[PDB]
Amino acid sequence: GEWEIIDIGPFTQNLGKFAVDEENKIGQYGRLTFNKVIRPAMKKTIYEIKGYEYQLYVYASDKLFRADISEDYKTRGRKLLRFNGPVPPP
């Protein structure tokens, strides 16, 4: 696949919210409150397209985490791949 840097507009913020919502279902960090996604946001496109992956820096409950998210082209399904941290600011 190929990687590009993307903006941190509303669509990206909603991916961050997705990630925190999914991590809350897992419960590994306890209950987290989504704050914001910060730069840099990275997007991978996997080939007709199979899907996408995102690597995001997400503040939740005033702590910084790294979240990876997949998105399937044909099913539109999103999945949280991993959620790690706290991490230092980029």
The answer to whether residues 52 and 41 touch, using CB atoms and an 8 Å cutoff, is no
The answer to whether residues 43 and 2 touch, using CB atoms and an 8 Å cutoff, is no
Resolution value in angstroms: 1.2
Secondary structure of residue 73 in the 3-state scheme: coil
**Experiment type:** X-ray
DSSP string of 5-69? EE--SHHHHHHHHHHHHHHHHH-TT-S--EEEEEEEEEEEEE----EEEEEEEEEETTEEEEEEE
Rounded Cα gap, residues 1 and 18, in angstroms: 23
Q: Does domain 2-84 match CATH 3.30.70.20?
A: no
